[PDB]
Amino acid sequence: EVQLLESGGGLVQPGGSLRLSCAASGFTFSNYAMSWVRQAPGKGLEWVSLISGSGGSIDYADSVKGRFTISRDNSKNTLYLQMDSLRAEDTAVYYCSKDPIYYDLSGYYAGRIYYFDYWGQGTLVTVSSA
Amino acid sequence: EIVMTQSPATLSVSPGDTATLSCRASHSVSRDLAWYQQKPGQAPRLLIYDASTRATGIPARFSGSGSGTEFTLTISSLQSEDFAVYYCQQYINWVTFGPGTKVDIE
Amino acid sequence: NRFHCHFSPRDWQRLINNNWGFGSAHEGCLPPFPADVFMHSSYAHSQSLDRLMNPLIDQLYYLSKTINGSGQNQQTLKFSVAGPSNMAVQGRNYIPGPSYRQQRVSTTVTQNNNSEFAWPGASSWALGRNSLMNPGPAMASHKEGEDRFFPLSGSLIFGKQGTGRDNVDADKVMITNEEEIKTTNPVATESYGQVATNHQSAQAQAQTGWVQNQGILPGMVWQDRDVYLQGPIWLQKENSKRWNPEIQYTSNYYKSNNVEFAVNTEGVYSEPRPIGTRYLTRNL
Amino acid sequence: IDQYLYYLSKTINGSGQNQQTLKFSVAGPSNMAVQGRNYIPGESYGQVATNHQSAQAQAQTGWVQNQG
Amino acid sequence: YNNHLYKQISNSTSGGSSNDNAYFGYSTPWGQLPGSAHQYGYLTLNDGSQAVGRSSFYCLEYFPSYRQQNNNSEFAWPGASSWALNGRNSLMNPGPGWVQNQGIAKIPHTDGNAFNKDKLNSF
Amino acid sequence: YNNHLYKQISNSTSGGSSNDNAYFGYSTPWGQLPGSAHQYGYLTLNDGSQAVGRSSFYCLEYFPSYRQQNNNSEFAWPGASSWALNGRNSLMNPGPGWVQNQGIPHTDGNAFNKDKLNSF
Amino acid sequence: NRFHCHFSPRDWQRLINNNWGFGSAHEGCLPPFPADVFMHSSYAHSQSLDRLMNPLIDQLYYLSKTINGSGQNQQTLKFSVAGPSNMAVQGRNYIPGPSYRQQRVSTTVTQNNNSEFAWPGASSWALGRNSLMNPGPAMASHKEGEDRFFPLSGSLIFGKQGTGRDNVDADKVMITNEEEIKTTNPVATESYGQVATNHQSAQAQAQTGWVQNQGILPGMVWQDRDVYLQGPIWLQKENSKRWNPEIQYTSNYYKSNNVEFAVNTEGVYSEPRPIGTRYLTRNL
Amino acid sequence: IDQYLYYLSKTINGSGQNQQTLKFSVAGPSNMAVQGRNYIPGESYGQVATNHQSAQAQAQTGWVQNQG
C-alpha cells in the first residue's frame, strides 16, 4: 500500500539551512503531485509547497517563499525539501503528502492541488540556538 | 487566503451520541472541502473530501454536508475509538485549514 | 466518423501498442458503447530534428568572433569548426515545420493575465469574417518538462461524460496535447525563430526580429496531428531494434471505485481520458 | 448540430481584482466563428499572438500581412 | 574504441553548462540505426543532460527567404538568424512594410516535407 | 432487465455488510464470458467494494479427508471448516496425534438530442 | 538457461504484453547484454476462485442458526438459502490449491521481532539433513493491500547490478512477489483454513484448529510460479473479449540520469528491476 | 559455483535493544541448505511457520508429522 516516510530533521540555529526527504513507495510516484504541509507544535496545519508530477510546476506558500525550495527525483521515488535561512518561527512537524489526481503525458497538470490523499508520519524540525 | 473557521472551539460528548461539527468559509468554496481527524501523536487522515464523500476504508458513521460558505460534519454513534482534533480544508485557490475542533469524551 | 464507433478501448490499445501505422466533427455519431440506442503515423520520434548529428566527430566552419576584444576599432573575423562542443551552430539538411503562433494559457489561473482575452488574444484568419484558428497547423503543445501551459486554440478539447453545454469548468473538459511531435515541430506557443532585420554597418548594430508565423520553406519536415479514440477519422508493423522497453498505454492497477471505460452504478458509460496513438518510436 | 469540441469561452468571472478563471463551451450553430475546421484559406490575412501573457502582460496580437 | 564498451555520453560529461548545446546519447565501440557532413555514436531524446523515458538505446551487437545578416560589437551569435525547437535555439545554417521572410543526405521519416561472474575487462 | 442497461453492482450497492461477502461486478440486461448451482450477471476482481485495474468489463452487445464438525451455542459459522483465499474465509461446502486432514477452471494444474434514448 | 540470454528487454515486452503463453539456477550463464565477454501461462486471472458465482441469483441450503437466541436449552436447527447477500457459504465445485506455510517478514524493520529468526523460524524439510524450503510451492506473497510483507524463503530474490556477495542491505536486492496468482492460490503466509478438532455435544463446544499445511485434495486448482526475464527456463495469441484496456508493462515517462536497461557512463549494463510474465488477463 | 539467488541471512545487527535489520546473502557452496531447489521429497517431514511474527511475538514453528 501507499507508504510515505520522512527522513532527517533536527536542530538548526536561526539562519541555518537543512534538507528534508521523503521516501515514497506502494504507488506510482511520478504520476502524482506531492506536497509538504506543516504543523507548529500547538498550532494547526499549514500548507507549505507543492510540486507536481515531473516537477515542471512548483508553488510555495507566501510564508516560505524565497527561503524554501522543493524538488523531486522520480528516479529514486524521493521528495525533497531544502530549508534555507530558517527562523525560530519555522519550527513544526513536517508532513509528506500526496495528491489524489493522476497525471500522464496525454493531459496537463491540474492548475491547483486537491485534498491530501495520504500522509507520512512527520519529522520534526526545531530552529533555536541551543 | 480564504479563512476557515471551526465553529466549536472544543466539544465533549458521551459514546453512542451523535456529534455535529461544522466550519465556515470566508468565501464560497463550492463542494470543495475536506475533513481530517488527527489523533494525538499521529498524522492526519482523510475522512471526507469534496463536501460529502467518504474516503476509502472510512466508517459509515462519518457524514459530510453543506455547500458554499457553511459545512457540517456529523459523527453517528460516536465511539471511544474517536478522540481527535478535526480540521476542514479548502482546495479552492491556495489550500488553507481550519483551526480544528477537539472532540473530548465524557 | 469517429474512432470509438469502430474500436473498443481494448481493441484501440491492441492497435496503438503494437503498430506504427494503419466531416465537421458534429454530434449524432454512433455511440461508443454498443448497448446505447441513439437518435497515419502512430509513433513518436526518438530523436529531435536538431540532434541527428554524430556526437563524437567534428564537421565545416562558422563565424566565431567579430571582435578581438573590448575597445575601439576591434573589428576582426575569426572562424571555428562546428563540432560536439558547440552543437547549436552546425550545418543541417532539414529544418522544423511551419508555425502560426498561439497565445499561451496556464491551467493555474493566477498565472494568467486578469482580463478577458479569450477571443481578443486568439489567433484568427479572415475570409470579411473572422474565424478562430482551431486547432490550426500541427504544433507541439508545450516544451518538454512543462505541464501547466497549453495553447489557446491549438489543441482539441473533449468534454467528459455529463459535461454541460456552456461555461463549464476546466476539470470537466479534457484537453489533448501533442508533446510527442515536439521533436520535429515548433512549439505552438513559441516563435519559429529569429531573422535579421537590417544591414549592419560600423554605425548601426545588427538588428533582429521575431518570426511569429512561418510558411512552408524547402527543407522543412513535420508531423501531422494525432488521432484520438474520440476524434474524427476522415496495419503497419513495428520493426524496431530498440534495446530498452517501449512506453505502452496501460491502465493503472490501483483500487478505485469504478473501472475506466466501463459503466457505473447508474448505467452510464464514460470515457475517462483521451487516448491518442503515439507510443512506439522510430528513429528520425 | 453542435460539435463535440470545446473552445475557451471566458477567462474571467467579471470585473474586479483576481477574477481569473477558465470556462469552456461547446462550439455550435450559435457561435460559428470558433468551430474547429479541417481546412484554411491560402486585407490582412489574420492575427497571431506576439507574446506570452501573464499577470503582468496582456495578450497581444499582430497582423499577418503575408502567408505561405 | 571505448575499450570495447558502450558508454553513455551526455552534455554534462563534457562539462555542458549551455542549454542550446545540451545533448544525450551513446558512444559505441563500432567504427534501423540513427549524413551530418562530418567512431560511431548517436544522440537520442534528452532533457538537458538527463534523458526522457522515450529515449532509445541501441546495441549494435544485436544485429522563399529567411533573411541573413562591420560594426565594432560582438554580433556572431546575437545577430544570427535561428530557429527554435523545444526551447533550444539553433543557428540557421546554411538555410534556404518589409517582408523579411516569405515561404512558398537522408530524409527523416515523417508525415510531410577460479571462476568469476564479472565480465572480462582485460584485452 | 435493468431497463436495457449494464449496471455496476458491488458490496456497497447492497449495503456493504462484511469483508468475507464483499464483491464487485456487473448486472446485464441479458438473460470467453464468465455451474454455480443456481438474468445474467457476473463478478470480477475486487478489493473490498472497490475494483482494481485487472477488473474486466464485458459488453455482451459486442458479440483424503478434511474434517467437518447439540451444544447450546451458535456454532454455524464459528465451528465450521473453511478455507481462506486472499484473506477471505469461505465455508468448505460440500468439500471432499490425530490427523485432522490428509491430502493425496482454466489454470496451470488441477429536435436532435445527443443523449441516449431512455424512452421505451 | 536464463530468459535474458535469449530475449532483449524490448523483445521480452512484446512477449508478455501480447501473449497468453509461449539446471540448479547457478551462475555462469551467457551475459544478458550481448557486448559482454564472459568466462506456460503468462496471464493473470480476472476472477477469483471464491467469486465464480452469478451475483444476481440464489442457489441449496446451509445451516444458519444453531440456537434460537440467548438463554438455556436453546438448541435448534435453522437453514437459509445460499445467495448473493451471503456469498461466503455458497457451495463451490473447486477449492484453492495446496499450501505449506512460510514465515512473514516486513520490509519495515521496526515491526519485525527483535531476535534472529532467519534460520530458526524458517520452514524447512528433512531428507538427516535439514534443507530450507525455498521458494516452495507456488503461493501468493501477501494479501491484497499489504505489499510490505514477504515470505521469509517464499520468493526468488535477485541482486541489483554490483550487489555484493555477503550481508547486503535490503535495497541491494530485488524481491519478486507472486501477486497475480492469489486468485487461485493461498497466501504463503496465511493458514490454508480451519478444520474440526472434536465432536461437539451438549457437554463440549465445537473446537477447531488451523491448518498450517495442505496437500493435494481432489478439486484443487492452482497456478504455477511465474518466470522472469532473469529467472531460469528449464506462442499463444490473446482471444479475450474484454472491453476495457488491459494492464501492460511500460517504461516510465520521467526524465532520469540513465535510461532503464542500458549502459551508464562507465559502460556498466544493468537490469533495474525484475519483469514478470503476467499482465494480460483471462477469465477463470 | 554460486547461485544468483539471495537468501535472508540476518534479522538483527547484533545483540542489544532495537537491533532490527534485514541482510541478504548469495546462496552458494558455502551454505548449501539454503539454496533454492526445484524438487522436494514425497522422522518429521519438516517444519512450518505457525504464526506471524511481530515486534510482540517471536517466530513460532511446528513439526509436520504427515504431508501429501
Residue numbers in the entry:
A (entry chain H): 20 to 149
B (entry chain L): 23 to 128
C (entry chain C), G (entry chain F): 287 to 308, 357 to 373, 423 to 442, 444 to 511, 513 to 619, 687 to 736
D (entry chain B), H (entry chain E): 440 to 481, 575 to 600
E (entry chain A): 252 to 282, 351 to 353, 357 to 360, 376 to 400, 482 to 487, 496 to 522, 594 to 601, 620 to 628, ...
F (entry chain D): 252 to 282, 351 to 353, 357 to 360, 376 to 400, 482 to 487, 496 to 522, 594 to 601, 623 to 628, ...
Sentences from the paper on this structure:
The AAV vectors are composed of non-enveloped T = 1 icosahedral capsids, consisting of 60 viral proteins (VP), and package single-stranded DNA transgene cassettes. A major challenge for the utilization of AAV vectors in the clinic is the presence of pre-existing neutralizing antibodies (NAbs) in a large percentage of the human population. This study structurally characterizes the interactions of 21 human-derived neutralizing antibodies from three patients treated with the AAV9 vector, Zolgensma®, utilizing high-resolution cryo-electron microscopy. The antibodies bound to the 2-fold depression or the 3-fold protrusions do not conform to the icosahedral symmetry of the capsid, thus requiring localized reconstructions. These complex structures provide unprecedented details of the mAbs binding interfaces, with many antibodies inducing structural perturbations of the capsid upon binding.
In each map, the capsid was well ordered, while the densities for the Fabs above the 2-fold axis could not be interpreted for model building. As for the 3-fold antibodies, only a single Fab bound to the 2-fold region, in two potential binding modes, resulting in distorted densities during icosahedral averaging. The localized reconstructions with C2 symmetry relaxation confirmed that only a single Fab is bound at the 2-fold region. In all maps, the VH and VL chains are well-ordered, enabling the building of atomic models. The epitopes for the sixteen 2-fold Fabs comprise VR-III to -VII, and -IX of the AAV9 capsid. On the aa level, all 2-fold-Fabs contact D532 and Y706. Other frequently contacted residues are T491, T492, R533, D556, N562, N704, and Y705, which are clustered around the 2-fold symmetry axis. Furthermore, for all the 2-fold Fab-complexes, movements occurred in VR-IX near the 2-fold axis. While, for AAV9 capsids in absence of Fabs the residues 704–707 adopt the same conformation in both symmetry-related VR-IX loops surrounding the 2-fold axis, there are numerous variations of side-chain orientations in the different Fab complex structures.
